[PDB]
Design a protein around this ligand. Structure first.
Ligand SMILES: Nc1ncnc2c1ncn2[C@@H]1O[C@H](COP(=O)(O)OP(=O)(O)OP(=O)(O)O)[C@@H](O)[C@H]1O
Ligand SMILES: Nc1ncnc2c1ncn2[C@@H]1O[C@H](COP(=O)(O)OP(=O)(O)OP(=O)(O)O)[C@@H](O)[C@H]1O
Ligand SMILES: Nc1ncnc2c1ncn2[C@@H]1O[C@H](COP(=O)(O)OP(=O)(O)OP(=O)(O)O)[C@@H](O)[C@H]1O
Ligand SMILES: Nc1ncnc2c1ncn2[C@@H]1O[C@H](COP(=O)(O)OP(=O)(O)OP(=O)(O)O)[C@@H](O)[C@H]1O
Ligand SMILES: Nc1ncnc2c1ncn2[C@@H]1O[C@H](COP(=O)(O)OP(=O)(O)O)[C@@H](O)[C@H]1O
Ligand SMILES: [Mg+2]
Ligand SMILES: [Mg+2]
Ligand SMILES: [Mg+2]
Ligand SMILES: [Mg+2]
Ligand SMILES: [Mg+2]
Lengths: 237, 105, 244, 52, 148, 426, 253, 385
């Protein structure tokens, strides 16, 4: 094939990018807040449909390395195409220059993939938007980036993407303070959980939280831990 | 824009005979075959006032003959056109009636 | 001009969305019903043929049950021609992972590979999708029996029980009211016949319109045995459950 | 005039004079007549400096 | 089939009443052109030796307005008098048209005819006459109000 | 029930009197005017009725026949043996007249033709052929020539009563406005400048551009300014049911324009009746093009057309057939495009001058924030800037109300932008 | 096909007869009723028959504009029909998707008689308001439910979808006896055996076996319908029905 | 009693005195003549005679003469007499003609058509605001658009804005697009002309521009007016194949519809409500800013908003204390507001077959099952997990 499927618009755009942005909104919702020493990406997980497994059904947040986690919102099918490249580039980094990836670098590469599919003949661009997070190796500053279909990436102190991202981000302007992150890791879990129960609702059976602490600690919380934070917050409120 | 209409207007002034100006959508008429009455009378008139020149402007309002499909057709256009041909035939005058026809299709 | 006759199968709509993947799923709702239930001692796979005739050989047909490898068989619902290709790909890939690692391929690996293949066609090439829906029954040591559905979008989701094809809404609702966590293959055999009985468009459900296979760990020496039941045992087990 | 019809060429005559009319001139000038070719033509958004 | 439709009701009315079956009333002849539709009716016109009228669908259109309906009443009245009678409308295509613009006078006059024939066909019921036989080489052009 | 019962009887009694006043008024005797000129008008109609100025049947001339010198009397004619120079001493006992100067061939509307004579309020010079004429219903004779054509009735109710929408409101002081004037306002207002030169001025404008650039705005603006006949026909209205009726609409339009001194016919939106001619075997494009081709021939004549300036306004100059767009029927194409930053600024100020605005409003900042916008979007911006004041309980606008406005109108309705699809033709 | 008689009775006959139960429940007034199945099931027959028992006008709409000269068009038939219905109320508008008369009208729209259905249905919601309650129910007759469009199959639009199968052997014997209540028989004719012989597929065909048998009573000059007349009937009508199905030929030329 | 009494006292003296005043004034009018008033009545009859022949005014000639077309076919150059005015005659108007010598003697006629009544409604909807189960803010964006400038034009001139024209009510099926339109149609009490978009394609060709232009003519007279255009989607999606003008014809109907919606007319106040199911199918010019100012969207109800839909609909019903209203919302997810209204009805219907007025929890669960099977959901979401 060789025909353009991305073409210039008489306005100033490409219609496939605006369209792709519309695609991220019709997806499920992932939230990002970083603490003083943690990233937390939590995601809304479906359960309209029932008899769905929990062990074998893939999660919304897929560990690339031992220190770089990626979450995605938009088409759940497409997602796996951006991640397959992203994992192999991380092993190539280890090979050719040594040291594992820096979060800034992986975000720039992932951006370059979506960038390319906005301008190469015979592709549409990805309808999928990432929160790519993690730690730099031998450092402990939390890093939280979000890249989007344009092929543009932005760093964010806290961010949210997917359905009702404007509604959630409004919440986060009013409770997360740029100057003083949540004082500990635990305060940071209560913030991501506090945000989700606005839009997601319908029990703690939908809320997923992955927490990363520096020095290669990836833990994904159990349904019991989630219930516990939702309950506290419901009651206090 | 190449002055086919110009050359006819000229021709009118030069021959000093009866010049019957005609516009092809004027001829089509919504009363059944009164469009045809218009063909025969205009040409009947041209026998009298002989020698003559009929100048027709357009010819895509006597359109074309290609319709045969069950759903509609327009056989109002065809009839007034087939009447035009019977006046050009041998039983009518044609040796004292010239027809000047001008079209851009 | 060539560009003049291009469909553009693979742009988005204004909704953010892929007309041709949506339509593909539309046509699989026409196709034959297939249901899979993962018991805790097997997986029962059962699918009802979309066509039937009495001159039609239906005794050695296996146009809905296809074995990918020794431990993973799938049920098919959609464009059978498109499926025959990817079944034969799958069979190449499953055998390949065994050749190079000398290890039984996990259910997860084969299912994800097939998904990404569908995924390549909605992503690029200017080609129509492969409209296939697979239900994968598979065994691995690691996670036991694993159950899975894949769509033409090239996305995979786990199940414990699921139904694709015609009458999806109807079948799905029925499974849920009955399904318990403590079920063995016997309860599963009964439910699979039974949901199919409620979605059926024949005046009574019969064996010649049923294809039926199981995978049991209750086969000897703690081994998984794939059994595609013959139509004469299906007719037998149909007398047991008292459907006919 | 290149692929003008004799109606287009009549158009350049009138157009020329209108441009004189604005200037307030009592004759049509040679400068104005050419200016009228360019006005009869649709392209009159002219340079944008992507022809330099 | 056509002898039992047309000829038989007249010669033996008594049998239909006995068995208790509805006798065939109006006859419609459909089939492509060039099958001998009209010729089969020619045969019964000699054979019955009853009255047999003659009439075309263009006997019932006229230059003056509403003088179509006045003919419709005339052919029935004549048939009733010299009953049992067969009326044949050769081509009934232009009366039984299935569409009307219903703003032109040409069409309004056929509207009036079509209701007038249909009404008095019910008037022609329970008579010694066998009702109107009519033919059309077309059959997708007819209003289904006749065909019920 | 005494307190309410007694008084209820009285209320009914009061209803009786209100009715009697009514029955007296309409019979002795309802007004139509003031009262007095409806009495006299009854005595005025008695005067008209005694006269036979009515009933006069309306008929029409088909052919002027000459009644003297044509051998109308055939007393010496037998084939061609007649003089054709006398019907006054041909074979007459008199020298003087015995027939009239002019006979004429009338056709009645019921259909019956009569050969009529010559009236006494008329001369042969006032009688034209095709002209509608009153004949006397006592004895058919032409009395009075009566304005021809009974056809205006859907070309007579589309002549405008002047709507007032300012020439100012049309955005900016653009070249695009001034181009209208070269064609319309100026040769009519002062033909003196063009006269010295001896230049016969242009006549055709094509306003073309995408939805909402103010083509229509401009239309209304020259309706009130020009002060000559403005006949605006919507061009979808040219389609009719019966084929050759549709051409008749626009054909009668030109008869009408031509009769009146100084016209501007404003053909609005000829995407309908403008389709390029093609052969398709289904039916042909015959009904659409019948009307279009009538038009074309009367935009150049086979004779000179009168003073008729014609304005075409379209959204797509690409559905239009090639014949219309060449000069000499559309002399000048006048191009309308989305404005720039200064352009967008003027239109905002032209909307905002009737609004309550603080002095803190810097329109430069919010025009910049609106890009690739129609003057019609910038209107929706102004309306929605006040709607947010109405919602907030504020009465005087803020910069803040215009920011809210710009985000909702521009971001939200960019999905629904006409600009994108329609630009492809423009 | 008795079960079906009882289902249409609930939705159509009962609310016109007494609005008082529907008030008590507070249930949102009935609307459209879709009848669907192959031909000759008597979906049309049941509509007329409900209309008789309820005692309501039966307004047949052909999807022809011909018979009307007082609308003369489909572009106001909607609302002009509702003026006439309100006068002659209660009414049951009957409208049938024929799907072989209006052949090309169906294509790309789900029915040009479902253009009729939807337009009249939109009226109906306000009719429950004009001055209390509905007096117009609408019954829609369709051959298929798959040639129906999705916007009339949605809930809160309709309120009932009655399905009709073709006859069973038991059902058949009943349908056959109705046509037999109007003509001659002779002792020794078992209606049961004629149900077996008949394979049928319409209740229409059943009525054709009775008329056709009466016509052989004429042929042989019998005085009553004999059993042998049924043997000649069944064969002839079947050969005629199956020929046109399998040759896919119509009555249209 | 005395509340009635003060009105009795004002109303009697003022009105009865006026009645007396008319009686004297007919007589006084008589005097300069000898009988003016009672003779104007005898003259009117005399002038007009009997019969009066109806004609149709063909064209009006400015000289107090007119060309009237009797439908019997002779045309006439008549005079215009008393009891008429020449701006009360417009081309098309019916005239009353003197039989002996034709003259326009009047037109007191109603001149009403059944063609206009099709456009109009006769109405008292069941639909009122707060039968809307939630989405309160959306009500107070629609009410700010349609209903509010009739109540107060004062706000909009005080601000100096032009009052917003046109609304497009779009979203998914079952989000109550028709339910809002009728709830506001009840409150406003402005002449609410209704027209369904499908009637705008006919069986003729060219009748399109003619029908569309007739809507807005009625709408214009009866100002202020609402013109509600229900599912203007149907004309773009479904071609019925009854129109001989084809795809071409439908496109032309669109174009007259653009001018009649705004254009050059400077007609009355006409709010337009346009229900549609997809706004990506309607012609972009048709929907473009400054002729459709405000565009409201509805999307599917929430867990709490479904509770509101249920209270308003279960309220009419007779109920048991076994009914747990709340468990009918938790079981039902991602279902419309249309489904909840059909669910109450379906429960009551099962309860009408059992021959009791009660509605039990079991008739509700039974009803809940059956309505959920019938909806066959989206393939829009089959991409996603
Ligand atoms: N060769 C020429 N010499 C002089 N003037 C010309 C010449 N050709 C065209 N013109 C001028 O251009 C004007 C417009 O062209 P005209 O309408 O006569 O053209 P045509 O090709 O017969 O068109 P159509 O088929 O579109 O009716 C003429 O009226 C004439 O004044
Ligand atoms: N079976 C037949 N035997 C002999 N001649 C026949 C037969 N069938 C038809 N023909 C011949 O064909 C002729 C034409 O047939 P006829 O006019 O009866 O046709 P039709 O099908 O009713 O068509 P139309 O509508 O064109 O009149 C007959 O006059 C006759 O000569
Ligand atoms: N240039 C402008 N300056 C100010 N207001 C503008 C401008 N252009 C348009 N408008 C506003 O937008 C309204 C709608 O645009 P208008 O109908 O005049 O335009 P058009 O380009 O002929 O559109 P269409 O053919 O799509 O109907 C005008 O009535 C006016 O209120
Ligand atoms: N949000 C809502 N709150 C309350 N009732 C609602 C709501 N949504 C739907 N309904 C109920 O469902 C009924 C049917 O919906 P309605 O006909 O108003 O829908 P619509 O969105 O215009 O759909 P379509 O375009 O498919 O006709 C209403 O009469 C009302 O009783
Ligand atoms: N169920 C039945 N029992 C008896 N007669 C029947 C039955 N169904 C149909 N008929 C007969 O067949 C005729 C034609 O059927 P009709 O009601 O018009 O059919 P449909 O809409 O099913 O095509 C009926 O008028 C009736 O005489
Ligand atoms: Mg014939
Ligand atoms: Mg416009
Ligand atoms: Mg020409
Ligand atoms: Mg049907
Ligand atoms: Mg609706």
């Amino acid at each position: 094939y060789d025909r353009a499927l991305s073409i210039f618009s008489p306005d100033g755009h490409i219609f496939q990018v605006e369209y792709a942005l519309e695609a991220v909104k019709r997806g499920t919702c992932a939230v990002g807040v970083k603490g003083k020493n943690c990233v937390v990406l939590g995601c809304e997980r479906r359960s309209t449909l029932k008899l769905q497994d929990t062990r074998i059904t893939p999660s919304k947040v897929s560990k690339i390395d031992s220190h770089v986690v990626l979450s995605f919102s938009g088409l759940n099918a497409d997602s796996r195409i951006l991640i397959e490249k992203a994992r192999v580039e991380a092993q190539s980094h280890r090979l050719t220059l040594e040291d594992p990836v820096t979060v800034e670098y992986l975000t720039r590469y992932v951006a370059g993939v979506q960038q390319r599919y906005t301008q190469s003949g015979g592709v549409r661009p990805f309808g999928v938007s990432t929160l790519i997070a993690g730690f730099d190796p031998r450092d402990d500053e939390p890093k939280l980036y979000q890249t989007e279909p344009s092929g543009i990436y932005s760093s964010w102190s806290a961010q949210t993407i997917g359905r009702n991202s404007k509604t959630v981000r409004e919440f986060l302007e009013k409770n997360y303070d740029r100057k003083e992150p949540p004082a500990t890791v635990e305060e940071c879990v209560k913030l991501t959980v506090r945000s989700l129960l606005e839009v997601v609702q319908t029990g703690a059976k939908n809320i997923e939280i992955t927490v990363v602490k520096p020095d290669s600690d990836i833990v994904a919380l159990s349904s019991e831990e989630i219930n516990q934070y939702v309950t506290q917050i419901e009651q206090e409120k | 824009g190449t002055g086919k209409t110009l050359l006819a207007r000229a021709c009118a002034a030069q021959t000093n005979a009866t010049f019957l100006k005609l516009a092809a959508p004027q001829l089509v008429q919504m009363y059944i075959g009164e469009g045809a009455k218009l063909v025969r009378d205009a040409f009947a008139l041209a026998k009298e006032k002989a020698p003559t020149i009929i100048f027709i402007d357009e010819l895509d309002a006597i359109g074309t003959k290609r319709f045969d499909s069950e759903k509609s057709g327009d056989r109002e256009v065809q009839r007034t056109m087939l009447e035009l041909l019977n006046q050009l035939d041998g039983f009518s005058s044609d040796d004292r009636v010239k027809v000047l026809a001008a079209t851009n299709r | 001009g060539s560009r003049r006759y291009d469909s553009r199968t693979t742009i988005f709509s204004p909704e953010g969305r892929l007309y041709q993947v949506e339509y593909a799923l539309e046509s699989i709702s026409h196709a034959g019903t297939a249901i899979g239930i993962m018991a805790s001692d097997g997986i029962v796979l059962a699918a009802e043929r979309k066509v039937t005739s009495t001159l039609l050989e239906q005794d050695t047909s296996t146009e809905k049950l296809y074995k990918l490898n020794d431990k993973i068989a799938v049920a098919v619902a959609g464009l059978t021609a498109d499926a025959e290709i990817l079944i034969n790909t799958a069979r190449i890939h499953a055998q390949n992972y065994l050749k190079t690692y000398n290890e039984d391929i996990p259910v997860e690996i084969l299912v994800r590979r097939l998904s990404d293949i569908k995924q390549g066609y909605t992503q690029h090439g200017g080609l129509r999708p492969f409209g296939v829906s697979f239900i994968y029954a598979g065994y691995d040591d690691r996670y036991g029996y694993q159950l899975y559905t894949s769509n033409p979008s090239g996305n995979y989701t786990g199940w414990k029980a699921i139904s694709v094809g015609a009458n999806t809404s109807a079948a799905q609702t029925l499974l849920q009211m009955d399904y318990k966590d403590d079920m063995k293959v016997d309860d599963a055999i009964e439910l699979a016949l039974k949901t199919l009985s409620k979605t059926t468009d024949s005046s009574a459900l019969t064996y010649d319109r049923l294809e039926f296979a199981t995978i049991r760990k209750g086969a000897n020496d703690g081994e998984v045995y794939q059994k595609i039941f013959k139509p004469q045992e299906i007719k037998d087990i149909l007398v047991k459950t008292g459907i006919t | 005039t290149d692929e003008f019809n004799g109606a287009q060429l009549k158009a350049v005559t009138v157009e020329a004079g209108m441009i004189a009319l604005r200037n307030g001139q009592s004759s049509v000038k040679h400068e104005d007549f050419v200016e009228g070719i360019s006005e009869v033509q649709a392209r009159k958004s002219k340079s944008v400096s992507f022809y330099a | 089939e056509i002898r039992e439709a047309v000829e038989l009701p007249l010669v033996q009315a008594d049998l239909y009443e006995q068995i208790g079956i509805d006798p065939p009333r109006g006859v419609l002849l459909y089939g492509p052109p060039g099958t001998g539709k009209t010729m089969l009716v020619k045969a019964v016109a000699n054979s019955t030796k009853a009255a047999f009228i003659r009439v075309n669908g263009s006997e019932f259109v006229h230059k003056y307005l509403g003088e179509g309906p006045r003919m419709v009443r005339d052919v029935f009245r004549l048939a009733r008098e010299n009953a049992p009678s067969i009326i044949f409308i050769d081509e009934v295509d232009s009366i039984a048209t299935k569409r009307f613009d219903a703003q032109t006078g040409s069409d309004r006059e056929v509207q009036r005819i079509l209701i007038e024939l249909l009404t008095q066909m019910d008037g022609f019921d329970q008579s010694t006459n066998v009702k109107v036989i009519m033919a059309t080489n077309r059959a997708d052009t007819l209003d289904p109000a006749l065909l019920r | 029930a005494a307190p309410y019962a007694a008084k209820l009887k009285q209320t009914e009694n009061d209803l009786k009197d209100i009715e009697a006043r009514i029955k007296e008024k309409a019979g002795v005797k309802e007004s139509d005017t003031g009262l007095a000129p409806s009495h006299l008008w009854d005595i005025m109609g008695d005067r008209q009725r005694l006269g036979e100025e009515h009933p006069l049947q309306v008929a029409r001339c088909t052919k002027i026949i000459k009644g003297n010198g044509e051998s109308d009397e055939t007393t010496t004619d037998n084939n061609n043996s007649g003089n054709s120079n006398s019907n006054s001493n041909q074979q007459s006992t008199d020298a003087d007249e015995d027939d009239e100067d002019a006979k004429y061939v009338i056709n009645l509307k019921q259909i019956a033709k009569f050969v009529v004579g010559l009236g006494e309020r008329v001369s042969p010079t006032d009688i034209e052929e095709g002209m509608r004429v009153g004949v006397d219903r006592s004895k058919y004779n032409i009395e009075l020539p009566l304005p021809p054509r009974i056809d205006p009735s859907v070309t007579m109710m589309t002549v405008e009563e002047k709507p007032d929408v300012t020439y100012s409101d049309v955005g900016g002081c653009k070249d695009q406005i001034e181009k209208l004037r070269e064609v319309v306002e100026l040769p009519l207002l002062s033909p003196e400048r063009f006269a010295t030169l001896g230049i016969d001025p242009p006549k055709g404008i094509l306003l073309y551009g995408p939805p909402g650039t103010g083509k229509t705005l401009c239309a209304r603006a020259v309706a009130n300014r020009t002060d000559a006949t403005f006949i605006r026909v919507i061009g979808s209205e040219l389609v009719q049911k019966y084929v050759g009726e549709g051409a008749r609409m626009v054909r009668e339009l030109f008869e009408m324009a031509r009769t009146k001194k100084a016209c501007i016919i404003f053909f609005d939106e000829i995407d309908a009746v403008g389709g390029a001619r093609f052969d398709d075997g289904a039916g042909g494009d015959n009904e659409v093009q019948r009307t279009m081709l009538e038009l074309i021939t009367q935009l150049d004549g086979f004779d000179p057309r009168g003073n008729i300036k014609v304005m075409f306004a379209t959204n797509r100059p690409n559905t239009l057939d090639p014949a219309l767009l060449r000069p000499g029927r559309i002399d000048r194409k006048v191009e309308f495009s989305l404005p720039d930053l200064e352009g967008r600024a003027n239109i905002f100020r032209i909307h905002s001058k009737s609004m309550s605005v603080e002095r803190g409003i810097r329109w430069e900042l919010i025009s910049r924030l609106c890009p690739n916008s129609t003057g019609a979007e910038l209107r929706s911006v102004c309306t929605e800037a006040g709607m947010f004041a109405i919602r907030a309980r504020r009465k005087v606008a803020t910069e803040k109300d215009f920011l809210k406005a710009v985000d909702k109108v521009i971001s939200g309705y960019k999905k629904f932008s006409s600009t994108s699809r329609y630009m492809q033709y423009n | 096909l008795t079960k079906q008689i009882k289902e249409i009775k609930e939705v159509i006959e009962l609310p016109v007869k007494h609005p008082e139960l529907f008030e008590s429940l507070g249930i949102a007034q009935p609307k459209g009723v879709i009848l669907y199945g192959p031909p000759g099931t008597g979906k049309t027959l049941l509509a007329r028959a409900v209309a008789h028992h309820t005692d309501c006008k039966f307004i047949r709409v052909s999807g022809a504009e011909l018979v009307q000269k007082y609308i003369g068009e489909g572009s106001r038939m909607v609302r002009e029909l509702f003026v006439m219905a309100r006068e002659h109320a209660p009414s049951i508008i009957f409208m049938d998707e024929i799907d072989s008369i209006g052949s090309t009208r169906v294509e790309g729209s789900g029915g040009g008689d479902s253009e009729v259905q939807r337009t009249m249905l939109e009226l109906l919601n306000q009719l429950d308001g004009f001055e209390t309650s509905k007096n117009i129910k609408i019954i829609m007759a369709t051959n298929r439910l798959d040639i129906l469009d999705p916007a009339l199959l949605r809930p809160g639009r309709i309120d009932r979808k009655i399905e009709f199968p073709p006859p069973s052997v038991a059902a058949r014997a009943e349908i056959l006896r109705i046509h037999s209540r109007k003509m001659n028989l002779t002792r020794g004719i078992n209606l049961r055996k004629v149900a077996e012989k008949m394979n049928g597929c319409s209740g229409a065909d059943v009525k054709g076996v009775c008329t056709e048998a009466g016509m052989y009573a004429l042929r042989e000059r019998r005085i009553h319908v004999t059993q042998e007349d049924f043997e000649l009937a069944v064969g002839k009508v079947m050969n005629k029905n199956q020929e046109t199905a399998i040759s896919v030929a119509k009555l249209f030329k | 009693t005395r509340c009635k009494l003060k009105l009795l006292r004002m109303e009697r003296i003022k009105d009865h005195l006026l009645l007396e005043e008319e009686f004297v004034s007919n007589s006084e009018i008589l005097k300069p003549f000898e009988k003016k008033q009672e003779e104007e009545k005898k003259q009117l009859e005399e002038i007009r005679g009997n019969p009066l022949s109806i004609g149709t005014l063909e064209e009006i000639i400015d000289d107090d003469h007119a060309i009237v077309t009797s439908p019997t076919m002779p045309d006439y150059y008549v005079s215009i007499l008393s009891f008429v005015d020449k701006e009360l005659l417009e081309p098309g108007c019916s005239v009353l003609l003197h039989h002996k010598t034709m003259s326009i003697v009047g037109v007191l006629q109603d001149d009403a058509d059944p063609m206009v009544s099709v456009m109009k409604m006769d109405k008292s909807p069941t639909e009122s605001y707060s039968d809307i189960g939630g989405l309160e803010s959306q009500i107070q964006e629609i009410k700010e658009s349609v209903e509010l400038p009739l109540t107060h034009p004062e706000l909009y001139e005080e601000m100096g804005i032009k009052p917003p024209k046109g609304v497009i009510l779009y979203g998914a099926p079952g989000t109550g697009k028709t339910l809002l339109a009728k709830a506001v149609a009840n409150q406003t009490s402005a002449t609410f002309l209704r027209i369904v978009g499908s009637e705008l394609i006919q069986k003729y060709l060219g009748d399109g521009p003619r029908l569309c232009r007739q809507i807005f003519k009625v709408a214009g007279e009866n100002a202020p007016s609402i013109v509600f255009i229900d599912e203007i989607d149907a004309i773009g999606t479904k071609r019925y194949d009854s129109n001989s003008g084809g795809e071409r014809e439908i496109q032309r109907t669109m174009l007259e519809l653009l001018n009649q919606l705004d254009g050059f007319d400077d007609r009355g106040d006409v709010k337009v409500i346009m229900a549609t199911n997809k706004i990506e199918t309607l012609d972009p010019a048709l929907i473009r800013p400054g002729r459709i100012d405000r565009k409201i969207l509805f999307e599917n109800p929430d867990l709490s908003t479904k509770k509101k839909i249920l209270g308003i609909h279960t309220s009419k019903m007779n109920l048991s204390e076994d009914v747990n209203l709340e468990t009918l919302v938790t079981t039902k997810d991602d279902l419309s507001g249309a489904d909840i209204q059909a669910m109450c009805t379906e429960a009551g219907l099962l309860a009408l077959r059992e021959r009791r007025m009660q509605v039990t929890a079991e008739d509700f669960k039974q009803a809940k099952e059956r309505v959920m099977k019938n909806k066959v959901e989206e393939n829009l979401e089959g991409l996603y997990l």
